[PDB]
Paper text:
Earlier computer simulations of the catalytic reactions of AHA and PPA, based on molecular dynamics (MD) free energy calculations using the empirical valence bond (EVB) method, could directly reproduce the T-optimum of AHA and explain its origin. Since only the cold-adapted AHA enzyme showed instability of the Asp264-substrate interaction above room temperature, we hypothesized that if its β7-α7 loop conformation could be brought to that found in PPA, then its T-optimum could possibly be raised. In particular, the final model (Chimera 4) that combines 16 mutations in all of the four identified regions above is predicted to almost entirely recover the stable hydrogen bond interaction between Asp264 and the substrate at 25°C, as opposed to the wild-type (WT) enzyme.
The inhibitor is known to be rearranged by α-amylases in crystal soaking experiments to form several different products. As can be seen in Fig. 5A, the mutated side chains in Chimera 4 are all very close to their position in the corresponding complex with mesophilic PPA. It appears that the extended β2-α2 and β8-α8 loops in PPA that pack against this motif are responsible for these differences, as Chimera 4 retains the shorter loops from AHA. The electron density is weak for the two residues Ala271 and Gly272 of the remodeled β7-α7 loop, in both the apo- and holo-structures, so that their backbone conformation cannot be confidently built. There is, however, clear indication from the partial density that the loop conformation is closer to that of PPA than AHA, as intended for Chimera 4. The mobility of the β7-α7 loop in the Chimera 4 complex with acarbose, as well as in PPA, is considerably less flexible than in AHA.
Numbering used by the authors: 1 to 270, 273 to 450
Write the structure that this text describes.
């Protein structure tokens, strides 16, 4: 049933907790990826979170008690917390952290200069041909930890195990490409149990380091997914997506974390083809495809309008602002609450017993429909005409809520939005307006 997580980028711990109770739990999201909760450098830019100072849980998102409160309140409604984990480095330079600690010259509350690789600079060419420099030199001046050192592994493992002890269920290993896979292996041997671990490795091909090196240590970000999906949605034909996945050169589905955009590449950090909230309904549709299609573990992005400043932090108005939700406009965008996206999550959540593509249909261009066997069916019309084809499904005949537009009542007698009819012979007579879609599934069926 739970199948999809969401990055609540720069949401603080109280907003996450309330969001779990009021929306993510009820709508079936599996987990929240939170911004780094450990002590980091002072400053309001979002990227301060990626400059650690210590592993005390005092950060822009809140203090340790507030962190625990969020973990608990989210867990109470069935939503896990995944922590963005800085395994590669500490802050650059000298300064002060969010818990009051000072640092400088590769000296921190828990590290000294010997705990780091010798200073050198990762240069653009190194990605293509110097594995050693990519993993032992400094990413944009950040102090590169000696991740082969037993002390460093133990210290990072203690941070991970502290977070597990208080209830955290997964971890994003930031900048995993900059850490030898064998160092990550040694780290994981000190990590208690088997939490969810996904490793951030950007590999579109042609580099010294390969995302495939990381398959044995956890899940891996498949950045090919969003890159190719955005190119297809912008310039290509949806019909080509019938074998999306391993046939496009992607890693195995059971290893991949997939997403349309992430916090870096919606700003042009870490792809002019990447779709983001800025693309409106094109983003809706791309998310509907992602969430209906049986490849990967999807992460929905949840952003703020940064008003053209790719460095700015988030709005200084909370999401839950004394009874008003600061979503959808020029503060928080709340893509995870957009109807087509949350509906796609419901569809994925209820078609997970059938990880196949069935009865693929298309018009050779930008209209597609397919099924998850008898568990669900979907269609996307990304053209300017109305889509009225008759398509074959394996669905039981009857009437179904279009979960992109509404939901089934508690009594199961009605839908709050459009109702789709599956005929006696299992067909559907589509009637999909331009740039619209539909999705139905067996657990959103009107019941006699
Ligand atoms: C941002 C990503 O950079 C690399 O990606 C490279 C790909 O690997 C390569 O294939 C090709 O596409 O190029 C890109 C390089 O542009 C890393 O591999 C990838 O891991 C990284 N993403 C994640 C990790 C980091 C680091 O913690 C995050 O970086 C953000 O935070 C840093 C540090 O604050 C910020 O840098 C700022 O500080 C420096 C000085 O320290 C100054 O130059 C300036 O003030 C700031 O830019 C980065 O801007 C920011 O991207 C990233 O968010 C993670 O997702
Ligand atoms: C929820 C789950 O979704 C995804 O898992 C699906 C795989 O991607 C599919 O490939 C398929 O896996 C089958 C393998 O293909 C096959 O080789 C064999 O190993 O059997 C597998 C199981 O049938 O179906 C999987 C769904 O069953 C995604 O890849 C996976 O990561 C997702 N699970 C995550 C989410 C939750 C949230 O609670 C956690 O419990 C899991 O630990 C996460 O990994
Ligand atoms: C928040 C909202 O985002 C989305 O819609 C964007 C559209 O995709 C863009 O096309 C554009 O809409 C313009 C229309 O195209 C145009 O016809 C005219 O009506 O002006 C519109 C606004 O300028 O901009 C939209 C964002 O401003 C996304 O598709 C949509 O689903 C999102 N709506 C959510 C928000 C509300 C508000 O509570 C909810 O009621 C909906 O259920 C959510 O889906
Ligand atoms: C606790 C220190 O451990 C490590 O030092 C080892 C080093 O690995 C080898 O020389 C073997 O012996 C020394 C002494 O144990 C770390 O390399 C060193 O950085 C550690 N000190 C840091 C940690 C603490 C507290 O966690 C601080 O008190 C200290 O200031 C800080 O530098
Ligand atoms: Ca490194
Ligand atoms: Cl702490
Ligand atoms: Cl990522």
């Amino acid at each position: 049933h739970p199948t999809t997580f969401v990055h609540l980028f720069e949401w603080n711990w109280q907003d996450v907790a309330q969001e779990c109770e009021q929306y993510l739990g009820p709508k079936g999201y599996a987990a929240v990826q939170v911004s780094p909760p450990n002590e980091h450098i002072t400053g309001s830019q979002w990227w301060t979170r990626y400059q650690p100072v210590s592993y005390e849980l005092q950060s822009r998102g809140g203090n340790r008690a507030q962190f625990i409160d969020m973990v608990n309140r989210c867990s109470a409604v069935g939503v896990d917390i995944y922590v963005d984990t800085l395994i590669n480095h500490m802050a650059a330079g000298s300064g002060t952290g969010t818990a009051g600690n000072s640092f400088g010259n590769k000296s921190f509350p828990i590290y000294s200069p010997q705990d780091f690789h010798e200073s050198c600079t990762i240069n653009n060419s190194d990605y293509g041909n110097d594995r050693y420099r990519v993993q032992n030199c400094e990413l944009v001046g950040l102090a590169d930890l000696d991740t082969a050192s037993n002390y460093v592994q133990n210290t990072i493992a203690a941070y991970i195990n502290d977070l597990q002890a208080i209830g955290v269920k997964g971890f994003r290993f930031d900048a995993s490409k900059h850490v030898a896979a064998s160092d990550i292996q040694s780290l994981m041997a000190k990590v208690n149990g088997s939490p969810v671990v996904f490793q951030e490795v950007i590999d579109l091909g042609g580099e010294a380091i390969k995302s495939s090196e990381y398959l044995s240590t956890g899940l891996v970000t498949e950045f090919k997914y969003g890159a190719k999906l955005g190119t297809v949605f912008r310039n290509g034909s949806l019909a080509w997506l019938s074998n999306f996945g391993e046939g496009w050169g992607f890693m195995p589905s059971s290893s991949a974390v997939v997403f349309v955009d992430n916090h870096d590449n919606q700003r042009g950090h870490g792809g002019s083809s990447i779709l983001t909230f800025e693309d409106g309904r094109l983003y809706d549709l791309a998310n509907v495809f992602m969430l209906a299609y049986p490849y990967g573990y999807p992460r929905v992005m949840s952003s703020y309008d940064f008003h053209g400043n790719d460095w700015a932090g988030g709005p200084n108005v909370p999401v839950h602002n004394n009874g008003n939700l600061e979503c959808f406009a020029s503060n928080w965008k709340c893509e995870h609450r957009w109807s087509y996206i949350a509906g796609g999550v419901d569809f994925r959540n209820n078609t997970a017993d059938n990880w196949a593509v069935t009865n693929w249909w298309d018009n050779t261009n930008n209209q597609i429909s397919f099924g998850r066997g008898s568990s669900g069916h979907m269609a996307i019309n990304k053209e300017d005409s109305t889509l009225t084809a008759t398509v074959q499904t394996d669905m039981a005949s009857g009437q179904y809520c279009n979960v992109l537009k509404g939901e089934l009542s508690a009594d199961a007698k009605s839908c709050s939005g459009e109702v789709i009819t599956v005929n006696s012979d299992g067909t559907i007579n589509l009637n999909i307006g331009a740039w619209d879609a539909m999705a139905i599934h067996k657990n959103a069926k009107l019941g006699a």
